[PDB]
Every structure is written in structure tokens, then in C-alpha cells.
């Protein structure tokens, strides 16, 4: 029997108080929703790498545990009984039931425990809670607190429970998984995310949040794992003659040292390593433990006798009587130096030993005597090991295995290791070439140690993993995209962007929502699920083109649209000394050794802060004087009360108040702007008041009053519509305008995303500052991120090293921050320049630039302030209704060709009229409407009519 | 007829810092963690650029509300547009676009595809071109209102200070001069590869940056070896960690250098895309009065053509 | 002429330009001619 | 220069002349039209004091 562990098996990773924070940690925890063995019955169970134990109790049946490796008194074993908590570690004799270097003496109940054994310490966490459930473990979450930590030094592999015989229990196992733990206001862990449970949890951990917004995220990577190990060495059975050197009858003099070559053999280096006959065994090349896993192209044994005090000279980087005149090793020497005392072997005195990179300079003798340590003779053997890339002949005692092709394996070729797929190559290696290399200096191909064949090494399949999801506010369902892989290799939908799994493929196209790539988008639709489709580019609409037909609008509407632009960003400033060396003189003195980096950081940030005020002024301060509207507002039916300042309020307009409601100790500070919101509102107020009462003149020079209706007539002529249209339809135009403004309010008050462009700036800068602070917790190789903890524990010689590691990491973090701020500032500056251009061309005048001041024919614009930016309301003229008219390029009268001075000729089926292009208003064709140029024998498409002569 | 070529986008690259620095190596991965969030910052910076690239593309090409098409009977008063309109037999690109497309060409490094494929870009340029030819400037401002092509030109002539009777009296000449000018464009583009150097330069610069980033993996940065596996198979953990830290610092520094340059280059591309988008609205959807903005001489009309990573404008 | 160039190491490479510094005979240098 | 079969088929002596110097600087055996900054002129000492 088994049950669902749900979210049990989480414990406090340490003993530090935290609150209101998401903390990421990796430790041995019970994986979420794993299966645990259900017992009802005292069997011996594996302990593995740690055990999660839980039980339900009613009558104190479950009373203890036994932990050990054999559990039979023949080994060290831990006994815990709870009858009063009693703990003993005697080698106890135990179907045991309950009817030393350490000793301690002091369903309705759920008892949970975590048992893990690390570096000799048996760590016990526990939690007891009330329950009301017989059938199974209750579902829920609670973190377990540390209770006991036993310094026993006892190996635990198996364990057994102890029951009282006159209660079910569960056993799971811990794994090295990553969890994101949520601490509430009182410092209690109230929730947690298991980062390996599923793709949504993986996304939550990646984003450091328990909430995920709508969109596509790159969170992890798909990586194929090796299935077996492949070990290959030459099939040689010869053993290397090391004994012939180390147990040699006689050694040569140091002035005339011997050099023996070792090749074509198996070298067991554990003999020389383990031998207790040596005075020293010092390796400069490789670490001894690993030495036996390698294979060399050759080993040379340099054999000689020197005086004891000279033994220290047999090394790289040395000078001295031997190092300079008798025997020298190169500074990059690779290998091991082995030496031992010969006082009971060579000493007699013995005058056969004389003294004068790898040079044999073929002079005095030493008299070695048994009664002379520094004056005693020593036998020295230097083993020079060549690890150059070449066919190897001297291999350690490692057994080979069979080689497996076209599989993902963990390989070892003569000491060269890696992970990848081995295939047959077509590479023609030269006789002396054992390995090939790629551009990244990785291994491209290898010649097999036993068989003369060349294999290619291709890294095992991998690719990026993206999670596609609607926000967790609506659904916890996700789809997963595997980037650049085949669906046959990893609802399954193959796209050019990767293999998409979990999204239904449908034929219907729609407007793109969450983009995937290569024309494919995803969305959440009906019951609901994630779907994928090829995006639509818009509706299709043909044009009824012919050589004699023109469509002319008969009616129009007034449209008001909103354009939102960033102008400025937060004026931050950072104190590099306080950031790196907050209140610490000892490191401050070392920071000075880096020169002017702090000066440069301060100047860069200051320059940006100043620029922010410049950007603000360029956009808003374009008015010479502060203008105000009259106490009597009569603009011909046009209602501006929702864009003009409200006297009862910072005297902002109604719409500006809406805009302002949608956008929201470490040496880090924030400086205020020069111009406060009140001052910005005065500038927009003046610009608006100026525009309404004086039109375009306040920009060009003096503000010259004009009736509003006449201002509009001017603006209409500017778009090709005769001014009589405005006056005849003045009531309609004013009503369409007033309605359009009301629509703006309904949208802005309900759609927060309307001002996303300004909110994005705020969010990006907030992230940069939070990231900069979080970096202070990094060690960067130091023993601790905290300078005070280093200084209170380490002395000045050592300490300075730990401090330099922190200075470099923290200084690098500041430079990264500043660079990004300068790049972002450039983007803001460009936006501010555009906004300033629009102020002059859209608000102070009238634009003739297509789609510059909104879609349609521009009439006028009104500025509104917003947090860190400006909002423009653009008023445009848009044709609404149209009719099909027959046309002609010219008319024949007396043979003369008549062309319109303005407008086009139109036919209603019986008569020809002339009318303005942007509004149907047919006039009688007369000599005062047309001009004559050329004749009927020249103009193509000319038609016959009668032109009236007044 | 003159040709103006502008970059719109750059390759959407992405780099896996863990695979780049510690490809398949747990021992150094555990040390990389000691540097905090540097990988998070590198990933966000590159992602932001990749997203921007699709934004730039859309701002330039998706300026049409509907997909417009020309009529089955093409009669534009003697003006031959068959070399700029889509060829039904082909990705249905125009003849000239096909010429443009023929001139521009394991380490944790990958490349992401664009949201809009070449086929989708061609549909947008097709709609913009079809719209301009049959409805002039109106499809931009609002509804597409059909107008005879010769009359559209008369409007465009009045806009440069030349009375419309000039167009009609010389309509045959004007159409012939136009048709010849287009043929000249083809002769140049098909033979002069350097004609699209502005787009090729973007491709070359980004290719160099990626190749340089990979080559840096071979550097030792003071270590005994650039290869982590060779360090791990040879040295014990106390010594090894030192050799590894030297490689981590050098490789992490190389990634930061790469990302910084990509952000700076992206800013240049963004500015170019903004200019291209401005020209689309002011040169193609309307008629410009801005000197030398839409080519030398008095602007009449413009036609967009797609190109690899950019847009090409033919200014009349 | 162009004589006096040798493989700098024993690693297989292909389709690549590899930069190396070693003791090589300089191109187009003069060499003593013996017949002695 | 290593060919497809891993044989050195060509080589540039970076100290032979200014064109070879340019080829080495650019890591290519082909040099495009233009002006390149490839090295530095430096006067050497003639005696020790
Ligand atoms: C703790 O004791 C267990 C035995 O209970 C050790 O595991 C054995 O190791 C040997 C040698 O590799 C194997 O042949 C046995 O099969 C293993 N037995 C079991 C049950 O796994 C374990 O290695 C000891 N722990 C330590 C650190 O020495
Ligand atoms: C301009 O429009 C506003 C709408 O916001 C009008 O204000 C409304 O007037 C009616 C009648 O007195 C009140 O019942 C509403 O409560 C008012 N609305 C608000 C938000 O206060 C205003 O009267 C109009 N002014 C002109 C001259 O037309
Ligand atoms: C032009 O369109 C406008 C609407 O945009 C028409 O005005 C509306 O007419 C209806 C009656 O059919 C009224 O109920 C609405 O209240 C009017 N709207 C406004 C804002 O006044 C206008 O009549 C149309 N003109 C022509 C000639 O068709
Ligand atoms: C538009 O111009 C093209 C030139 O590209 C004309 O196509 C040529 O027509 C002639 C006569 O049939 C053929 O011999 C050529 O081979 C065609 N050229 C190509 C590239 O196909 C086309 O006929 C012209 N159309 C109009 C209406 O003038
Ligand atoms: C204006 O210039 C055009 C050329 O750009 C002249 O048209 C050419 O006239 C010659 C005869 O002299 C013909 O051989 C060419 O084929 C014509 N070219 C075209 C495109 O048709 C035009 O005649 C000149 N007009 C005036 C009044 O001088
Ligand atoms: C538990 O066992 C100890 C053994 O020393 C005994 O002294 C104690 O009274 C017992 N307590 C209970 C509740 O049985
Ligand atoms: C913290 O404890 C107090 C009781 O002192 C309680 O009122 C409050 O709700 C607790 N806060 C949380 C987040 O549990
Ligand atoms: C040298 O001889 C001793 C026995 O006195 C032996 O233990 C040792 O392994 C020999 N050394 C070698 C390299 O064989
Ligand atoms: C491996 O063994 C085969 C015999 O099966 C032998 O022919 C071959 O030479 C051996 N390889 C090496 C490198 O010794
Ligand atoms: C998110 O959920 C809340 C319910 O708490 C709902 O009121 C809100 O409208 C939802 N947000 C969106 C964008 O649907
Ligand atoms: C997947 O493999 C099949 C061959 O079985 C091939 O036809 C298809 O194009 C491949 N798709 C991708 C994305 O590689
Ligand atoms: C689209 O419709 C075709 C039939 O015309 C069918 O074969 C195809 O599977 C459909 N695709 C999807 C995603 O429904
Ligand atoms: C003009 O005529 C065409 C063809 O009958 C028709 O599709 C189009 O809707 C008509 N347009 C107007 C404004 O009547
Ligand atoms: C054209 O307009 C005139 C003047 O209003 C009118 O008498 C005539 O009937 C109209 N023709 C048609 C076909 O509607
Ligand atoms: C308009 O097109 C029709 C149909 O092709 C043709 O008969 C007529 O002559 C053309 N008129 C003009 C002025 O081109
Ligand atoms: C216009 O009238 C004249 C007669 O004065 C005639 O010759 C010519 O063909 C007519 N044009 C059209 C288009 O009907
Ligand atoms: C490589 O060798 C093959 C013969 O196996 C030959 O055909 C080919 O041309 C050679 N390639 C080069 C670059 O020399």
C-alpha cells in the first residue's frame, strides 16, 4: 500500500529569522506529490539518503526507531524511544518491540519527522499537529522545525520502527531538490514551490514569484542524460618496471644522473603512493588520487643521490647548488618527486657520490657516513609525466569496457572524459594524431585506444524549454514548447519554432495573443484550453477599381485617439563606498587601490539625472506665458471641461486625475525632479488654454484671440474641406467631439493597461535596483558576503583576501547597473524628443504629416500630463459614408478641354457636377469652377457636357 | 525612381550562460551560483532585444488595416506595375523582391525565429502597394476609396505645383518614363550586390559577434587549461576549484561584453526601424512635402518592397 | 621560398586557420648552399 | 591553413611583408579593399646604459 505525500516533508533549512520574503534553497526535501509506503508490522527499511517519516496515532502504539547498518548488535546503532524522550547509541541487541558515546533522558495525533545523516550528524526535524482522520494522511502544509542534532559519527543504511504490542505510518525518501519557500509577516513558512514538480512550478521558481503573468517564458533546458559509461585503454598486460628504479642496487651521482624511459606498460601508481618507505612524495603535475585514472605518452625516471639539505631543490621554480649546476627541473614541470633516506643503505665514508632543464653536464665528492639528517644521503627519483595530446603508452590499472555506438554515454578515452554520442567518423588522422579539436577547443573526434578507427563525438540532444501560459489569475494549465527539436525526438504540434505540446492545433486564425514564432500564436479559449494557430494579418478587402469610377465620401465623423509617450525616468544615485564598504574602513582603504572607478560611476549617474529634467522641460515648457481660459466658457458647443483644470483639486483636469491613478540603507537613493506635478500641470494648462482661445498663434508669436468656431474653420480648410461644411454642420461636429471625449474617459478609467508604456518604464527601473541590492548577498568566492563577519573572524593577512573577492564582485555589479541605466536613458531621451516634436507640431499647430498626429486627417491636439510622461489626445477628421460616382478627367464644351480648379467631375447618371474630393457637395459646372487648357483631341477619357457661362 | 534601403531588424539570438560557462559540469555550476544573478540579467537583456525585433518589424510593415488586392484587370493608364506586384507563380513575392532576397545572405548559443515569416511580410507589402495603386492616399486616412490611376496622379502633380493639365497632355510620356525607370532599377539590383550593403553589414556584424564569443572559450585566462574536463580529470578538488574560478571569470566577462554590444547595436536598429516606419506613413500612405525625405526631387509617390531584415523603398 | 614549416603539434584539425608561434624558417630567407 | 583532410596546405608568415601582416591581423588569407590598422612602428634600443 502507498499514499500521496502531497506537500509534506518541508522543513526550515536553517535557523535564521526571515519575514515577508521568498527564499530559494536547495536541500534534501521530500518531493511534492511523491508516493510513500503505507504501513499498518515492523519491517526493516532502507534509509538511503535520508528518510521522511510520518505517522497517525490514537493510543501511543508507535514509540521509537532503530538506525544502523546491520541492526543486530554487531555494529554501531542509534536507538530512540519515546515512552519522556530517551536516546542511546549503545550496540543494542534486537522482531523487536516495546511492550554508549551518547545518552539523553528527559486518528487524533499526526507526528512527522525528517531524518538525515550529514558529516557524522544525525539531524532530526519534527512537527506534531492535531488531526481528525482515520483513513489516510491529511492534506495540508506545515514546515518542520529542527529539534535534535546528534554528534554520533555513526553510518546509517537501514532502519526499523518500534511498536507497542497490547497506528499506520508512512515512509518516504528525501531528494536534493530546489524549493522556493514563502515566509509570512510572522516569519513562518506558509507555502512552498517544488521547482521540479511541473512546468508551472518551474516557471514560478524562475520568476521568483508564486504568481505568473500571461505570456511565454524561457525557464529551463532539455538535456539528454548518459545511460552507461564507456572506458577505453590499450589492451596491454605488461607491467611497468618501477621496481627496477626504486629498488635499484645503486643510484648515480647527481652531477651525472641516470634517465630511464618507461613505456609500453601498465603503471600501478598506488604502490609508490601507499609505500611507507618514502620520506616524501610530492606531485606538481596531477593529484595522486587521480593519477591512476590517466594514461601518459611516456614516463621518465631520473635517478640520483644528493645530500639531505639539497632535497628541497628538486622542484620547478628552484635555484641552488643542485638546481643550477647538477640537476634542474623546468618551471612548468609535470610529474612527481619521490625521495627517501639512504643512511642505512649507502652511507659507510661513501665517497662515490659527486656534485658539481634535464641537462646532463658530464667537481667534488661528499663523504656520507651513518653518524652524520641534513648531512645524510637521500635517494631521489623524479618521475616526469608527459600529458601532451599524442598516442599514449603508459596507462593506469583501469579495466576497459565494450564501446557502444549511437548512444548517449559517459566516456573515458585514455583519461579524456566527457558526455556525448560516439559515431563513426570519416576523418583521416595522421599516424601520430590521437585526438581532434573544434573551434571551442572541445574534442571533435577520437581514435579508439584499442581499435584503429576514428569516432566523432556529438554532444547529446538538448534545447531550450519555454512555458506558455494564461495568467495564474485565470488558469493553472500550461503548454510547453521545446525549442528547435523534433516531436519524434523529445496534443503534439510541430512548428518551425520547436515542438509544442499541450496546445490544441486549430484551423481558425485570429489576432495574435501570445506569440510563439514562425507565424504561430497561442491563446486560452473554449471548457477552456490552450490552443495554437497561424495568426491572421487582418481582414481581406478588395477595391472596386475601374478607370471611370470614383468613390466620394458623403458624411464624416470626429475621432479622438490617445497617444502615450514616456518623457523621463527615476533620477537614481548610488554611493559606491557605502554600497561596497558600508561603515568599514578596512576595505575602504583597499577600494582606493582601484583608482577612479567610483568617480566615473558617480558622474555617469549624475549626468543621467540632469538629463531627466532637460527631457521634461523640452516637452512641457514650450509656452512663453501662462495662459488661462476666460470665466465664461463658450466655444461654440465644444465641451472642454474634462481636459481643462478642475479648480477644486494640484489643479489637474478630470482626465489627468485618471491617468495618475493607473501608473504606480545600502547606499542607494532617489532624487526628486526639478518640476513637480503641480508645475507640469500649469504648463499643460497654459498650452491647452492657449490653443483653445488663440489657436496656432500663441506658438508662432503673440496669442491672438479667435472665435473657436472660426478656428475650426481654418483647421477644416487645412484638410481640404471647405469651411461652409463646418458651419452648416457645427452642431453635429460639436456633438461628435463631445461624445468622443466621454469615450476617452470610459476607457482610461477602466483599462489599466492603457498606460502600460509608462508602467513598463517604472517596472524596469525598479527591477534594476532590486537586483543591485540582492547582489550584496553573493559571496563571489568569499567565505561570507558580510564584511563584518570576515573582520571579526579572520586576521589581516587572510582577511584582505576575502575582502578583495567581495570588492571585485560588488564593483562589477555597480558597473553593470550603470551601463544599463545609460542605455535605457538613451531610449527615454529619444522618446522625449519625439514627444517634444509632437507638442510643437500637433498641439501648437496643425500637422500635414500622415499618421504623425493620429489616424485620419489631423485637426487639433490637446496635451495631458501623466506620471513620468505625456499623453496626447488627437482630434481627427475621418470620412464615414461614401457613394459610387462616374467620373472623367476633363469635359468638352466647344472643343475646349475644361478642368476643375478644385475637386473632381462627377456624374449622378444624368448630369455632371463638380465637387471637392473629401466631401460630396455637387456644384453646377461653370466657367468660374473650371479652367481651359488644351483640347478634346489630347485628353484621354474626356467627355461631352455643357459648361455654364454666367 | 530611386532606391532607399533601411534595416528594420536583427537576429534574435539567445545564450544559455550555464551551458556556455559550465557545459555539462556540475562541479563548476555550483561555483557559478556564488556570483548571484548575473545569468538572470544576461538572459533578460537578450530576451528584451529579441522581443523588440518583432515590434520593429510590425511598426514598419503592419500599417494597413486590411489586406488589399489589385483587380484581375490591370489598367492604370499606361503605368506598368507588374515588376513590383506579387508574382502568382512564386512565397508570392514580386520580381524585384526576389532580386533583393538573392543579394543579402553546442556552446549554449541559439537563434530564435521571427514571429512574422517572409510570407507574412510580403502580404503586408502587397496590401500596401495594392492599396496605394487603387485608392491612393485614402486607405491610409480611412476607407479605401477607388480612384482612376490617372486622376490619382493629377492630384499628386497639383501637390508639387504643376497644373493637372500637364499630366493629361503628357500622360503617354509620363507613363513611359516611369516604366523605363523601373526597368533601370532591376538592371542595377540584379547586377550590383553592394546595392544592399546596408542590410548585409548588419548580418556580418552580428555573425562576427557570435563567432568571437565562441572563440573565447578556447582562452585559458590564466588557467592550466581552457577545458573543464581536463582540469577535473587531473586536479583534486582543493586545487581544481582555483583553475575553474579563473575560467568562470573569463567566460562570464565575455558574455557580459557580448550582451552590452548587442544592446547598443539594437538601439541603432531601433532608430532605423523608427525611420522606416515614418517613411512608410509619410512616403507610401500619403505624399511628402519634406525636402529630400522621400528621395531627391519633388515627391509624387512611393512603393515598399520587402528585403531580408529590412525594407526597400522605391521613390518616384 | 616557403620551406621550413612543420606541424606545431599532434592535434587533428580541419577546415580552419590556426595561429601559432614557434621556431620556423622565415619565408624567402637565404640558406647556405653546400656541394664539402 | 588546414584543408578538409586536416593537411596544412598553405601558410602566412606574419612578418614577411605588410600584406601578410594584414592577412594575419584579419585572420584570413584574403584581404578586402580598404585601409586597415594592423600594427605599430617601434624603435628599438641600440645599447645598454
Ligand atoms: C555504511 O554501511 C553500508 C553497509 O550497510 C555500506 O554499503 C556497502 O558498501 C559495500 C562496498 O561498496 C557494498 O559491497 C555493499 O553491498 C554495500 N551494502 C549496502 C547495504 O549498500 C556503506 O558504504 C557504508 N557507508 C560508508 C560511508 O562507508
Ligand atoms: C460638459 O460635460 C460634463 C460631463 O462630464 C457635464 O457635466 C454633467 O452635467 C449634468 C447636468 O448638470 C450633471 O447631472 C452631471 O453629474 C455632470 N457630470 C459630471 C461628471 O459632473 C457638463 O455640464 C457639460 N458642460 C457643458 C457646457 O456642456
Ligand atoms: C452623418 O452621420 C451622423 C452620425 O455620425 C448623423 O447624425 C445622427 O443622426 C441620427 C438620426 O438618424 C440621430 O439619432 C443621432 O443622434 C445623430 N448623431 C449626432 C451626433 O447628432 C447625421 O445625420 C449624418 N448626416 C447625413 C447627411 O447622413
Ligand atoms: C510590363 O513590363 C514587362 C517587362 O518585364 C512586360 O513583360 C514582357 O512582355 C514581352 C512581350 O510579351 C515578353 O517578350 C517579355 O519576355 C516579357 N518580360 C518578362 C520579364 O516576362 C509586360 O508585358 C509589361 N506589361 C504591360 C501591361 O505593359
Ligand atoms: C521632353 O523629354 C522627353 C524625353 O525625356 C522627350 O521624349 C522623347 O522624344 C524623342 C524624340 O526626340 C523620342 O525618340 C523618345 O522616345 C521620347 N521619349 C519618351 C519616353 O517618349 C519629349 O519629346 C520632350 N518634350 C519636349 C517638349 O521637348
Ligand atoms: C519512560 O522510561 C523511563 C526509563 O528510564 C522511566 O523512568 C519513565 O518513568 C518512563 N515514562 C513513562 C511515561 O512510561
Ligand atoms: C501574525 O500573528 C498575529 C498574532 O499576534 C496575527 O493576528 C496575524 O494575522 C499573523 N500574521 C500572519 C501573516 O499570519
Ligand atoms: C620495492 O621493494 C619493496 C619491498 O621491500 C616493495 O614493497 C615495493 O613495492 C617495491 N617498489 C616497487 C616500485 O615495486
Ligand atoms: C587490441 O587487441 C587486438 C586483439 O584482439 C590487437 O590486435 C590490437 O593490436 C590491440 N590494440 C592495442 C592498442 O594494443
Ligand atoms: C483577476 O482575478 C480577480 C478576482 O480576484 C478579478 O476581479 C480580475 O478581473 C482578474 N483579472 C483579469 C485581468 O481578468
Ligand atoms: C522530424 O523528422 C521527420 C523525419 O522522420 C522529418 O520529415 C521532419 O521534417 C522533422 N521535423 C523537424 C522539425 O525536424
Ligand atoms: C484543417 O482542415 C483540413 C481539411 O481541409 C484538415 O485535413 C486539417 O487536419 C485541419 N487542420 C486542423 C488544425 O484542424
Ligand atoms: C461600388 O460598386 C462596387 C461594385 O458593385 C461595390 O462592391 C461597392 O460596394 C460600391 N461602393 C459604394 C460606395 O457604393
Ligand atoms: C442628378 O441631379 C439632378 C439635380 O438634382 C436631378 O434632377 C437628377 O434626377 C439626378 N439624376 C439621377 C440619376 O439621380
Ligand atoms: C475604360 O475601360 C474600358 C474597358 O476596358 C474601355 O473600353 C474604355 O475605353 C476605357 N476608357 C478610358 C478613358 O481609358
Ligand atoms: C464629343 O463630341 C464630339 C462632337 O463634337 C465627338 O466627335 C466626340 O467623339 C465626342 N466624345 C465622346 C467621348 O463621346
Ligand atoms: C581529401 O581526400 C580525398 C580522397 O579521399 C580527395 O578526393 C579530396 O579532394 C581531398 N580534399 C582536399 C581538400 O584535398
Numbering used by the authors:
A (entry chain A): 27 to 66, 80 to 122, 125 to 135, 138 to 142, 166 to 172, 186 to 245, 263 to 444, 447 to 454, ...
B (entry chain B): 722 to 811, 813 to 827, 855 to 1065
C (entry chain B): 32 to 66, 80
D (entry chain B): 278 to 326
Sentences from the paper on this structure:
Coronaviruses gain access to host cells using the homotrimeric transmembrane S glycoprotein protruding from the viral surface. S comprises two functional subunits: S1 (encompassing the A, B, C and D domains) and S2. These subunits are responsible for binding to the host cell receptor and fusion of the viral and cellular membranes, respectively. The distal S1 subunit comprises the receptor-binding domain(s), and contributes to stabilization of the prefusion state of the membrane-anchored S2 subunit which contains the fusion machinery.
